DNA sequence: ATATATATATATATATATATATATATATATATATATATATATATATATATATATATATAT
DNA sequence: ATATATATATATATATATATATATATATATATATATATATATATATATATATATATATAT
């Protein structure tokens, strides 16, 4: 019932907004406010990259441990198979692994990542973007979606 | 942009010489001081009354007498704690008012640095990406000055929530997966934590 | 929570001795190196 | 005419030497933190003088 | 009874001295960075030996 009431109040909100929009009274984000508003958007994204960089090290060390253990003579074939499977299951369950797995699940649901990239492209085109950030940051943010795929 | 490059080394030369946090990270005795200060302010947010702060500090320093590799007070730990509080007030790490001491924003940044260093719960989390997705959606719908764009956005969103209402009236609503809620909530905490520092 | 307090100074002792970033911030020549490195990687993202 | 062996020319790989650059180790100069000493500042001990309120005697 | 002068007692302020703590300045020890020197590694110069494909002469 809480979700029901939430949905009801929200549909009332968007119904009011639709009544306004059909009359043509919609309002834009105040141009100056859009500057810091877009800059906040950029500030959020910066974290994702700097922790995928940490995911890199996590997986590197997991793989190196797997190798150094494979030298172990006493490891039966089953033992090495079990070590690979367990070292990857556990690795995927650390916060690094959770971030990586969620991003991977976005890939299956690709349309959302594509929509995010499209919206980003539309965002940085607006004149406000020029004031908000230097061209370097516009270049980075637009291709953040691809950059996650690369990393 | 190269002008910023030339001017920037002035900024970093100044900070390395002047700003409190960087000087603290530089000093030989940085880790002990940072750990003690974090311990003090961690367990209370109102600003410690000075007597309580110095007593707790003299208690903490006693634990680190086992850490013989850095200064150990041989005879009077309370004097040592008082001296260290004086010193850290001198370095603008802690400013005290009304007898209640507080951790300067410089020390806040300093501690926020070393916290993010070690193998940790990283600043980001899984829900961060969905957060930015929703935020980009909202901001794009806002900046869009074309009214028909807002009309279509409202129509699609109302259709989404109308489908969800049809489901909810049938009772099929779904909760956030309990494990996913953990880092989802940790994300929300991480977001707001910045407000305090600024 | 006090156990975390006792164990924590080990974490910061190790990092101040071991982790790259903190060691860099510590060294005397840190600002020049940091400015130059920022300049390099700033203008391109592909490596 | 085809197949096998020798001489030729070309291409390549290799050997040795020279110079250049990198890396490792030692010594040096320098900056940082600590500690020592002096002086100064804060508090408290001890006692005196001063200041205030009161009562008592005197003058109207 | 009012109003002024004196003595009394109580309270507070002040003065000087002792001790304790803080702060400032100087000296010393230690850590960090740089530089010097040695040796080793990488490349390239010079030339030689070897390897491969070809062509020519001989045998079937």
Short mmCIF file of C-alpha atoms (C1' of nucleotides) in Angstrom, two decimals:
data_model
loop_
_atom_site.label_atom_id
_atom_site.label_comp_id
_atom_site.label_asym_id
_atom_site.label_seq_id
_atom_site.Cartn_x
_atom_site.Cartn_y
_atom_site.Cartn_z
CA UNK A 1 0.00 0.00 0.00
CA UNK A 2 2.94 2.35 0.56
CA UNK A 3 4.04 1.77 -3.04
CA UNK A 4 0.44 2.29 -4.15
CA UNK A 5 0.24 5.66 -2.39
CA UNK A 6 3.68 6.67 -3.70
CA UNK A 7 2.61 5.86 -7.25
CA UNK A 8 -0.65 7.77 -6.76
CA UNK A 9 1.05 10.94 -5.52
CA UNK A 10 3.66 10.73 -8.27
CA UNK A 11 1.04 10.26 -11.00
CA UNK A 12 -0.75 13.28 -9.58
CA UNK A 13 2.52 15.22 -9.88
CA UNK A 14 3.10 14.25 -13.51
CA UNK A 15 -0.59 14.73 -14.33
CA UNK A 16 -0.39 18.32 -13.10
CA UNK A 17 2.79 18.78 -15.13
CA UNK A 18 1.11 17.30 -18.21
CA UNK A 19 -1.85 19.65 -17.80
CA UNK A 20 0.65 22.52 -17.71
CA UNK A 21 2.63 21.22 -20.69
CA UNK A 22 -0.45 20.75 -22.88
CA UNK A 23 -1.06 24.45 -22.20
CA UNK A 24 2.59 25.20 -23.00
CA UNK A 25 3.62 26.59 -19.60
CA UNK A 26 6.59 24.23 -19.07
CA UNK A 27 9.65 25.79 -17.44
CA UNK A 28 13.32 25.19 -18.15
CA UNK A 29 16.13 24.86 -15.65
CA UNK A 30 17.31 28.40 -14.95
CA UNK A 31 20.24 28.93 -17.30
CA UNK A 32 22.76 29.87 -14.60
CA UNK A 33 21.49 27.11 -12.31
CA UNK A 34 22.06 24.61 -15.13
CA UNK A 35 25.79 25.37 -14.91
CA UNK A 36 26.37 23.94 -11.44
CA UNK A 37 23.60 21.42 -12.13
CA UNK A 38 25.61 19.93 -15.02
CA UNK A 39 28.85 20.25 -13.07
CA UNK A 40 27.33 18.10 -10.32
CA UNK A 41 26.50 15.50 -12.96
CA UNK A 42 30.13 15.49 -14.04
CA UNK A 43 31.35 15.33 -10.44
CA UNK A 44 29.36 12.14 -9.83
CA UNK A 45 30.74 10.33 -12.87
CA UNK A 46 34.38 10.92 -11.93
CA UNK A 47 34.18 8.29 -9.18
CA UNK A 48 33.22 5.41 -11.49
CA UNK A 49 36.49 5.58 -13.43
CA UNK A 50 38.71 5.85 -10.34
CA UNK A 51 37.23 2.65 -8.87
CA UNK A 52 37.20 0.65 -12.08
CA UNK A 53 40.92 1.41 -11.91
CA UNK A 54 40.86 -0.34 -8.52
CA UNK A 55 38.88 -3.26 -9.94
CA UNK A 56 41.75 -3.68 -12.38
CA UNK A 57 44.21 -4.18 -9.52
CA UNK A 58 41.82 -6.50 -7.68
CA UNK A 59 41.49 -8.85 -10.66
CA UNK A 60 45.22 -8.60 -11.44
CA UNK A 61 46.12 -9.75 -7.93
CA UNK A 62 43.48 -12.49 -7.98
CA UNK A 63 44.95 -13.84 -11.22
CA UNK A 64 48.52 -13.63 -9.91
CA UNK A 65 47.52 -15.53 -6.78
CA UNK A 66 45.88 -18.17 -8.97
CA UNK A 67 49.13 -18.56 -10.91
CA UNK A 68 51.38 -18.69 -7.85
CA UNK A 69 49.10 -21.37 -6.40
CA UNK A 70 49.04 -23.38 -9.63
CA UNK A 71 52.76 -23.92 -9.08
CA UNK A 72 51.75 -25.90 -5.98
CA UNK A 73 52.49 -29.53 -6.76
CA UNK A 74 50.02 -30.97 -4.24
CA UNK A 75 47.11 -29.27 -6.04
CA UNK A 76 45.12 -31.97 -7.78
CA UNK A 77 43.43 -30.99 -11.02
CA UNK A 78 40.15 -30.77 -9.12
CA UNK A 79 41.84 -28.55 -6.54
CA UNK A 80 42.97 -26.07 -9.21
CA UNK A 81 39.53 -26.05 -10.84
CA UNK A 82 37.99 -25.41 -7.42
CA UNK A 83 40.49 -22.65 -6.71
CA UNK A 84 39.70 -20.87 -9.98
CA UNK A 85 35.95 -21.13 -9.42
CA UNK A 86 36.14 -20.04 -5.77
CA UNK A 87 38.62 -17.21 -6.32
CA UNK A 88 36.34 -15.81 -8.98
CA UNK A 89 33.06 -16.28 -7.09
CA UNK A 90 34.50 -14.62 -3.98
CA UNK A 91 36.18 -11.89 -6.03
CA UNK A 92 32.87 -11.08 -7.73
CA UNK A 93 31.23 -10.69 -4.30
CA UNK A 94 33.60 -8.05 -2.93
CA UNK A 95 32.45 -4.44 -3.41
CA UNK A 96 34.77 -4.27 -6.42
CA UNK A 97 33.01 -7.32 -7.80
CA UNK A 98 29.58 -5.89 -7.02
CA UNK A 99 30.33 -2.68 -8.94
CA UNK A 100 31.75 -4.66 -11.85
CA UNK A 101 28.81 -7.09 -11.89
CA UNK A 102 26.24 -4.29 -11.84
CA UNK A 103 28.00 -2.56 -14.72
CA UNK A 104 28.04 -5.88 -16.60
CA UNK A 105 24.31 -6.26 -16.01
CA UNK A 106 23.91 -2.84 -17.58
CA UNK A 107 25.47 -4.30 -20.74
CA UNK A 108 22.71 -6.91 -21.03
CA UNK A 109 20.27 -4.03 -20.57
CA UNK A 110 22.20 -2.02 -23.15
CA UNK A 111 19.38 0.35 -24.12
CA UNK A 112 19.76 2.21 -20.82
CA UNK A 113 23.50 2.78 -21.32
CA UNK A 114 22.82 3.91 -24.88
CA UNK A 115 20.11 6.28 -23.64
CA UNK A 116 22.50 7.66 -21.03
CA UNK A 117 25.15 8.28 -23.69
CA UNK A 118 22.58 9.90 -26.00
CA UNK A 119 21.32 12.17 -23.22
CA UNK A 120 24.91 13.07 -22.37
CA UNK A 121 25.48 14.01 -26.01
CA UNK A 122 22.40 16.25 -25.90
CA UNK A 123 23.49 17.76 -22.57
CA UNK A 124 26.98 18.91 -23.52
CA UNK A 125 25.62 20.48 -26.71
CA UNK A 126 23.62 23.04 -24.73
CA UNK A 127 25.29 26.46 -24.37
CA UNK A 128 25.36 26.04 -20.59
CA UNK A 129 27.85 23.19 -20.99
CA UNK A 130 30.44 25.57 -22.46
CA UNK A 131 30.42 27.58 -19.22
CA UNK A 132 30.11 24.54 -16.94
CA UNK A 133 33.25 22.69 -18.04
CA UNK A 134 36.34 22.95 -20.19
CA UNK A 135 36.28 21.01 -23.44
CA UNK A 136 38.38 18.22 -21.92
CA UNK A 137 35.67 17.35 -19.40
CA UNK A 138 32.92 17.47 -22.03
CA UNK A 139 35.01 15.09 -24.14
CA UNK A 140 35.50 12.72 -21.21
CA UNK A 141 31.89 12.67 -19.97
CA UNK A 142 30.37 12.04 -23.40
CA UNK A 143 32.59 8.98 -23.85
CA UNK A 144 32.30 7.82 -20.24
CA UNK A 145 29.85 5.14 -21.39
CA UNK A 146 32.39 3.77 -23.87
CA UNK A 147 35.22 4.22 -21.38
CA UNK A 148 33.52 1.92 -18.87
CA UNK A 149 33.21 -0.68 -21.64
CA UNK A 150 36.92 -0.33 -22.40
CA UNK A 151 38.09 -0.65 -18.80
CA UNK B 1 45.26 25.90 -21.52
CA UNK B 2 49.05 25.95 -21.19
CA UNK B 3 48.81 29.14 -19.13
CA UNK B 4 47.03 27.12 -16.46
CA UNK B 5 49.88 24.62 -16.73
CA UNK B 6 52.50 27.31 -16.05
CA UNK B 7 50.48 28.87 -13.22
CA UNK B 8 49.54 25.56 -11.61
CA UNK B 9 52.95 24.69 -10.17
CA UNK B 10 52.64 27.93 -8.21
CA UNK B 11 49.40 26.64 -6.69
CA UNK B 12 50.94 23.30 -5.71
CA UNK B 13 54.17 24.90 -4.47
CA UNK B 14 52.10 27.17 -2.24
CA UNK B 15 49.85 24.40 -0.89
CA UNK B 16 52.73 22.03 -0.16
CA UNK B 17 54.29 24.89 1.82
CA UNK B 18 51.16 26.36 3.39
CA UNK B 19 47.93 24.37 3.47
CA UNK B 20 47.45 22.41 6.73
CA UNK B 21 46.35 19.02 5.38
CA UNK B 22 49.26 18.58 2.98
CA UNK B 23 51.80 19.65 5.61
CA UNK B 24 50.28 17.11 8.00
CA UNK B 25 50.50 14.30 5.45
CA UNK B 26 54.13 15.29 4.89
CA UNK B 27 55.35 15.21 8.48
CA UNK B 28 57.26 12.19 9.75
CA UNK B 29 54.72 11.61 12.54
CA UNK B 30 51.60 11.89 10.35
CA UNK B 31 49.97 8.46 10.83
CA UNK B 32 49.87 8.50 14.64
CA UNK B 33 48.38 11.99 14.76
CA UNK B 34 45.84 11.24 12.04
CA UNK B 35 44.69 8.02 13.69
CA UNK B 36 44.33 9.66 17.10
CA UNK B 37 42.42 12.65 15.73
CA UNK B 38 40.11 10.41 13.71
CA UNK B 39 39.45 8.35 16.83
CA UNK B 40 38.54 11.44 18.85
CA UNK B 41 36.10 13.16 16.48
CA UNK B 42 34.68 9.88 15.15
CA UNK B 43 32.64 8.98 18.23
CA UNK B 44 30.98 12.39 18.64
CA UNK B 45 29.79 15.11 16.27
CA UNK B 46 29.01 18.04 18.59
CA UNK B 47 32.61 19.09 19.17
CA UNK B 48 34.30 17.61 22.21
CA UNK B 49 34.40 19.64 25.44
CA UNK B 50 38.07 20.39 25.88
CA UNK B 51 38.52 18.54 29.18
CA UNK B 52 36.77 15.44 27.81
CA UNK B 53 38.79 15.66 24.59
CA UNK B 54 42.12 15.90 26.38
CA UNK B 55 41.25 13.05 28.75
CA UNK B 56 40.22 10.82 25.85
CA UNK B 57 43.40 11.82 24.02
CA UNK B 58 45.59 10.97 27.01
CA UNK B 59 43.81 7.61 27.05
CA UNK B 60 44.42 7.01 23.34
CA UNK B 61 48.10 7.98 23.47
CA UNK B 62 48.63 5.45 26.27
CA UNK B 63 47.55 2.68 23.88
CA UNK B 64 50.32 3.79 21.52
CA UNK B 65 53.08 3.64 24.13
CA UNK B 66 53.39 0.10 22.80
CA UNK B 67 54.29 1.81 19.50
CA UNK B 68 57.79 2.56 20.77
CA UNK B 69 58.90 3.51 17.26
CA UNK B 70 57.57 7.03 17.88
CA UNK B 71 57.56 9.27 20.93
CA UNK B 72 56.44 7.66 24.18
CA UNK B 73 55.74 9.82 27.22
CA UNK B 74 57.77 8.31 30.05
CA UNK B 75 56.17 10.01 33.07
CA UNK B 76 52.94 11.99 32.45
CA UNK B 77 50.58 11.06 29.58
CA UNK B 78 48.13 13.82 30.49
CA UNK B 79 50.78 16.49 29.93
CA UNK B 80 51.53 14.85 26.58
CA UNK B 81 47.88 14.96 25.52
CA UNK B 82 47.56 18.61 26.53
CA UNK B 83 50.74 19.46 24.61
CA UNK B 84 49.50 17.68 21.49
CA UNK B 85 46.16 19.48 21.65
CA UNK B 86 48.02 22.78 21.95
CA UNK B 87 50.23 21.84 19.00
CA UNK B 88 47.35 20.78 16.75
CA UNK B 89 45.57 24.03 17.59
CA UNK B 90 48.79 25.79 16.59
CA UNK B 91 48.77 24.03 13.20
CA UNK B 92 45.12 25.03 12.65
CA UNK B 93 44.19 21.34 12.61
CA UNK B 94 41.74 21.98 15.47
CA UNK B 95 40.04 25.27 16.34
CA UNK B 96 38.23 25.49 19.66
CA UNK B 97 35.36 27.81 20.55
CA UNK B 98 33.30 28.00 23.76
CA UNK B 99 35.63 25.35 25.15
CA UNK B 100 34.33 22.85 22.58
CA UNK B 101 37.09 21.92 20.14
CA UNK B 102 36.33 21.16 16.49
CA UNK B 103 38.16 19.58 13.56
CA UNK B 104 39.02 22.20 10.96
CA UNK B 105 37.91 21.46 7.41
CA UNK B 106 41.60 21.11 6.51
CA UNK B 107 41.91 18.16 8.87
CA UNK B 108 38.63 16.84 7.49
CA UNK B 109 40.14 16.72 4.00
CA UNK B 110 43.36 15.26 5.42
CA UNK B 111 41.52 12.39 7.11
CA UNK B 112 39.26 11.87 4.10
CA UNK B 113 42.43 11.29 2.08
CA UNK B 114 44.03 8.50 4.11
CA UNK B 115 40.64 6.83 4.58
CA UNK B 116 40.25 6.28 0.82
CA UNK B 117 43.79 4.86 0.48
CA UNK B 118 43.69 1.31 1.83
CA UNK B 119 41.77 -1.63 0.42
CA UNK B 120 38.36 -0.39 1.44
CA UNK B 121 34.76 0.15 0.57
CA UNK B 122 35.51 2.45 -2.35
CA UNK B 123 33.86 5.84 -2.76
CA UNK B 124 31.73 4.39 -5.55
CA UNK B 125 29.21 1.56 -5.26
CA UNK B 126 26.99 -0.44 -7.59
CA UNK B 127 23.98 1.87 -7.19
CA UNK B 128 26.12 4.87 -8.21
CA UNK B 129 25.59 4.09 -11.89
CA UNK B 130 21.80 3.89 -11.59
CA UNK B 131 21.94 7.10 -9.56
CA UNK B 132 23.76 8.92 -12.35
CA UNK B 133 21.39 7.38 -14.90
CA UNK B 134 18.35 8.83 -13.13
CA UNK B 135 20.14 12.15 -12.61
CA UNK B 136 21.07 12.44 -16.30
CA UNK B 137 17.48 11.61 -17.23
CA UNK B 138 16.15 14.36 -14.96
CA UNK B 139 18.72 16.96 -16.01
CA UNK B 140 18.19 16.29 -19.72
CA UNK B 141 14.43 16.55 -19.35
CA UNK B 142 14.98 19.84 -17.50
CA UNK B 143 17.45 21.56 -19.85
CA UNK B 144 15.31 20.65 -22.87
CA UNK B 145 13.65 23.97 -23.81
CA UNK B 146 11.44 22.42 -26.50
CA UNK B 147 7.98 22.02 -24.91
CA UNK B 148 6.97 18.97 -26.97
CA UNK B 149 10.04 17.21 -25.58
CA UNK B 150 8.72 17.76 -22.05
CA UNK B 151 5.29 16.59 -23.22
CA UNK B 152 6.72 13.33 -24.54
CA UNK B 153 8.88 12.86 -21.44
CA UNK B 154 5.84 13.30 -19.20
CA UNK B 155 3.83 10.89 -21.35
CA UNK B 156 6.46 8.15 -21.21
CA UNK B 157 7.04 8.58 -17.47
CA UNK B 158 3.30 8.60 -16.71
CA UNK B 159 2.94 5.45 -18.81
CA UNK B 160 5.74 3.84 -16.79
CA UNK B 161 4.13 4.72 -13.47
CA UNK B 162 0.67 3.75 -14.77
CA UNK B 163 1.97 0.28 -15.60
CA UNK B 164 3.51 0.16 -12.13
CA UNK B 165 0.16 1.21 -10.62
CA UNK B 166 -1.61 -1.54 -12.55
CA UNK B 167 0.90 -3.98 -11.07
CA UNK B 168 0.58 -2.57 -7.54
CA UNK B 169 -3.22 -2.73 -7.56
CA UNK B 170 -2.70 -6.43 -8.33
CA UNK B 171 -0.11 -6.65 -5.54
CA UNK B 172 2.92 -7.62 -7.64
CA UNK B 173 5.17 -4.81 -6.38
CA UNK B 174 8.82 -5.74 -5.83
CA UNK B 175 11.23 -4.58 -3.14
CA UNK B 176 14.87 -3.65 -3.51
CA UNK B 177 16.81 -6.90 -3.19
CA UNK B 178 17.92 -7.05 0.43
CA UNK B 179 21.63 -7.46 -0.33
CA UNK B 180 21.44 -4.78 -3.03
CA UNK B 181 19.90 -2.50 -0.41
CA UNK B 182 23.15 -2.58 1.56
CA UNK B 183 25.38 -0.84 -0.98
CA UNK B 184 22.35 1.07 -2.31
CA UNK B 185 22.02 2.74 1.11
CA UNK B 186 25.78 3.10 1.49
CA UNK B 187 25.72 5.03 -1.79
CA UNK B 188 23.10 7.46 -0.46
CA UNK B 189 25.22 7.96 2.65
CA UNK B 190 28.32 8.62 0.55
CA UNK B 191 26.50 11.23 -1.54
CA UNK B 192 25.34 13.41 1.35
CA UNK B 193 28.62 13.19 3.27
CA UNK B 194 30.14 15.78 0.92
CA UNK B 195 27.64 18.50 1.90
CA UNK B 196 29.23 18.77 5.34
CA UNK B 197 32.74 19.48 4.06
CA UNK B 198 31.67 22.19 1.62
CA UNK C 1 34.85 -0.22 18.07
CA UNK C 2 37.99 0.33 20.14
CA UNK C 3 39.52 -2.75 18.50
CA UNK C 4 39.26 -0.93 15.18
CA UNK C 5 41.00 1.99 16.88
CA UNK C 6 43.93 -0.16 18.03
CA UNK C 7 44.23 -1.91 14.66
CA UNK C 8 43.84 1.29 12.64
CA UNK C 9 47.23 2.81 13.41
CA UNK C 10 48.72 -0.30 11.81
CA UNK C 11 46.82 0.51 8.61
CA UNK C 12 48.05 4.11 8.55
CA UNK C 13 51.60 3.12 9.51
CA UNK C 14 51.67 0.67 6.61
CA UNK C 15 50.18 3.09 4.07
CA UNK C 16 52.51 5.94 5.03
CA UNK C 17 55.38 3.51 4.44
CA UNK C 18 54.04 1.61 1.44
CA UNK C 19 51.17 3.06 -0.60
CA UNK C 20 52.39 5.04 -3.64
CA UNK C 21 50.17 8.13 -3.38
CA UNK C 22 51.01 8.92 0.24
CA UNK C 23 54.73 8.41 -0.36
CA UNK C 24 54.50 10.80 -3.31
CA UNK C 25 52.74 13.48 -1.26
CA UNK C 26 55.46 13.04 1.36
CA UNK C 27 58.51 13.51 -0.85
CA UNK C 28 60.09 16.96 -1.01
CA UNK C 29 59.80 17.24 -4.80
CA UNK C 30 56.11 16.29 -4.79
CA UNK C 31 54.51 19.47 -6.24
CA UNK C 32 56.63 19.58 -9.41
CA UNK C 33 56.09 15.90 -10.16
CA UNK C 34 52.36 16.09 -9.48
CA UNK C 35 51.89 19.17 -11.66
CA UNK C 36 53.83 17.65 -14.55
CA UNK C 37 51.99 14.34 -14.35
CA UNK C 38 48.62 16.09 -14.21
CA UNK C 39 49.60 18.15 -17.25
CA UNK C 40 50.55 15.05 -19.24
CA UNK C 41 47.51 12.85 -18.67
CA UNK C 42 45.11 15.81 -18.70
CA UNK C 43 45.24 16.49 -22.43
CA UNK C 44 44.57 12.88 -23.48
CA UNK C 45 42.75 9.89 -22.02
CA UNK C 46 43.85 6.95 -24.21
CA UNK C 47 47.23 6.48 -22.54
"C1'" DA D 1 65.79 -35.27 -70.72
"C1'" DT D 2 66.16 -35.63 -65.32
"C1'" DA D 3 68.65 -36.06 -61.27
"C1'" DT D 4 72.97 -35.23 -58.34
"C1'" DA D 5 77.06 -32.70 -57.03
"C1'" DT D 6 80.06 -28.40 -57.14
"C1'" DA D 7 80.78 -23.29 -57.76
"C1'" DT D 8 78.71 -18.93 -57.59
"C1'" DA D 9 76.30 -14.84 -55.58
"C1'" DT D 10 73.22 -13.08 -52.18
"C1'" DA D 11 71.39 -12.81 -47.96
"C1'" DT D 12 71.76 -13.47 -43.34
"C1'" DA D 13 73.42 -14.33 -38.99
"C1'" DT D 14 77.09 -13.83 -35.95
"C1'" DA D 15 81.67 -11.90 -33.27
"C1'" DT D 16 84.07 -8.47 -31.41
"C1'" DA D 17 84.82 -3.57 -30.24
"C1'" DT D 18 83.22 1.25 -29.08
"C1'" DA D 19 80.37 4.30 -27.17
"C1'" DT D 20 76.21 5.44 -24.69
"C1'" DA D 21 72.77 4.90 -21.05
"C1'" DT D 22 70.87 2.47 -17.01
"C1'" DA D 23 71.15 0.74 -12.87
"C1'" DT D 24 73.24 -0.06 -8.20
"C1'" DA D 25 75.94 1.29 -4.50
"C1'" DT D 26 78.46 4.90 -1.47
"C1'" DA D 27 79.16 9.52 0.31
"C1'" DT D 28 77.50 14.11 0.98
"C1'" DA D 29 74.59 18.03 2.02
"C1'" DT D 30 70.45 19.31 3.60
"C1'" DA D 31 65.63 19.51 6.21
"C1'" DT D 32 63.01 17.79 9.93
"C1'" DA D 33 62.06 16.49 14.21
"C1'" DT D 34 63.50 16.19 18.73
"C1'" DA D 35 65.46 17.68 22.90
"C1'" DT D 36 67.75 21.40 26.32
"C1'" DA D 37 67.69 25.65 28.37
"C1'" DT D 38 65.87 30.27 29.33
"C1'" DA D 39 62.66 33.08 30.12
"C1'" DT D 40 58.06 34.17 30.60
"C1'" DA D 41 53.28 33.43 31.95
"C1'" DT D 42 49.64 31.21 34.85
"C1'" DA D 43 48.07 29.67 38.85
"C1'" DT D 44 47.88 29.41 43.83
"C1'" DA D 45 49.70 30.33 48.87
"C1'" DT D 46 49.88 34.10 52.59
"C1'" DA D 47 48.84 38.07 54.39
"C1'" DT D 48 47.48 43.33 54.40
"C1'" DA D 49 44.96 46.90 53.17
"C1'" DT D 50 40.99 48.54 51.56
"C1'" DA D 51 36.08 48.79 50.97
"C1'" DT D 52 30.98 48.04 52.58
"C1'" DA D 53 27.42 47.22 55.72
"C1'" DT D 54 26.11 47.58 60.10
"C1'" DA D 55 25.51 49.45 64.86
"C1'" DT D 56 26.16 53.11 68.46
"C1'" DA D 57 26.83 57.68 70.04
"C1'" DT D 58 26.13 62.65 69.22
"C1'" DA D 59 23.80 66.83 67.50
"C1'" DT D 60 19.49 68.99 65.79
"C1'" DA E 1 12.93 60.71 65.06
"C1'" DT E 2 16.56 62.32 61.47
"C1'" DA E 3 21.05 62.97 60.16
"C1'" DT E 4 26.33 62.68 60.85
"C1'" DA E 5 30.47 60.76 62.83
"C1'" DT E 6 33.05 56.92 64.83
"C1'" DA E 7 33.99 52.08 65.78
"C1'" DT E 8 33.13 47.32 64.66
"C1'" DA E 9 33.08 43.26 61.86
"C1'" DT E 10 32.84 41.00 57.25
"C1'" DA E 11 33.97 40.66 52.62
"C1'" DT E 12 36.86 41.51 48.83
"C1'" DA E 13 40.66 43.17 46.59
"C1'" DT E 14 45.33 43.38 46.28
"C1'" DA E 15 50.81 42.23 46.92
"C1'" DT E 16 54.39 39.42 47.07
"C1'" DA E 17 56.35 34.91 46.79
"C1'" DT E 18 56.55 29.88 45.22
"C1'" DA E 19 55.79 26.63 42.23
"C1'" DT E 20 54.28 24.79 37.64
"C1'" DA E 21 53.47 25.01 32.78
"C1'" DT E 22 54.01 27.21 28.08
"C1'" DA E 23 56.37 29.20 24.82
"C1'" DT E 24 60.63 30.61 22.21
"C1'" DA E 25 65.25 29.95 20.84
"C1'" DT E 26 69.53 27.01 19.98
"C1'" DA E 27 71.92 22.56 19.34
"C1'" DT E 28 71.89 17.83 17.99
"C1'" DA E 29 70.55 13.61 15.73
"C1'" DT E 30 68.29 11.54 12.06
"C1'" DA E 31 66.03 10.90 7.37
"C1'" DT E 32 65.85 12.33 2.50
"C1'" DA E 33 67.33 13.75 -1.43
"C1'" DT E 34 71.14 14.53 -4.54
"C1'" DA E 35 75.37 13.62 -6.58
"C1'" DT E 36 79.69 10.49 -7.79
"C1'" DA E 37 81.59 6.43 -9.14
"C1'" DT E 38 81.53 1.54 -10.85
"C1'" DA E 39 79.87 -1.67 -13.18
"C1'" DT E 40 76.60 -3.65 -16.47
"C1'" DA E 41 73.43 -3.48 -20.26
"C1'" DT E 42 71.85 -1.78 -24.96
"C1'" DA E 43 72.75 -0.28 -29.13
"C1'" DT E 44 75.50 0.22 -33.18
"C1'" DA E 45 80.03 -0.14 -36.08
"C1'" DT E 46 82.92 -3.65 -38.81
"C1'" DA E 47 83.84 -7.50 -40.64
"C1'" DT E 48 83.58 -12.93 -41.17
"C1'" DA E 49 81.48 -16.98 -41.29
"C1'" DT E 50 77.65 -19.47 -42.53
"C1'" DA E 51 73.16 -20.63 -44.93
"C1'" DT E 52 70.05 -20.60 -49.22
"C1'" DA E 53 68.87 -20.24 -53.84
"C1'" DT E 54 70.57 -20.39 -58.15
"C1'" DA E 55 73.16 -22.12 -62.12
"C1'" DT E 56 76.53 -25.35 -64.43
"C1'" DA E 57 78.85 -29.77 -65.02
"C1'" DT E 58 78.46 -34.78 -64.71
"C1'" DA E 59 75.98 -39.25 -64.45
"C1'" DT E 60 71.92 -42.14 -65.55
#
